Amino acid sequence: KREQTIENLYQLAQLTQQVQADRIEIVLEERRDEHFPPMSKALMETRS
DNA sequence: AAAAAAAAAAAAAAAAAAAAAAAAAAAAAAAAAAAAAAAAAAAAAAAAA
């Protein structure tokens, strides 16, 4: 009588792999299109 | 004519309620601190008197 239980767990898993893909899309929107902010030639003297 | 018995009475005792007092709690302030946000002074880079 675990039919309900397991199929319902798969139904959460099925609607939630959608959430995983949604997070991947959130990344794609958030993917940088940019790099690490550069140095100012004085932070060069400071840290380097 | 008098005694005893019987009946209609005040004083004391018991219980509850309303006045007041102190402490505690909800609240409802005017004042300060911390964090956040909007400008500013020495150093650095490129083309040119």
CB atoms within 10 A of CB A37: 6
Q: Which residues, 6 or more positions from A39, have their beta carbon under 8 angstroms from its beta carbon?
A: A47, A48
Residues A23, A31: Cα–Cα separation, whole Å:
12
Asked if strand B comes closer than 7 Å to A47 Cβ, the answer is no
Q: How far is the CA of A40 from the C1' of B39 (A)?
A: 22
**Three-class secondary structure of residue A10 per DSSP:** helix
Residues 7-46, chain A, CB closer than 7 Å to nucleic strand B: 41-42, 45
Q: Report which DSSP code applies to A41.
A: S
Q: Which residues, 6 or more positions from A48, have their beta carbon under 8 angstroms from its beta carbon?
A: A39
Nearest to A31 by CA among A19, A41, A23, A39: A23
| Token code pair at residue A11 | 């139904």
Residues A22, A14: Cα–Cα separation, whole Å:
13
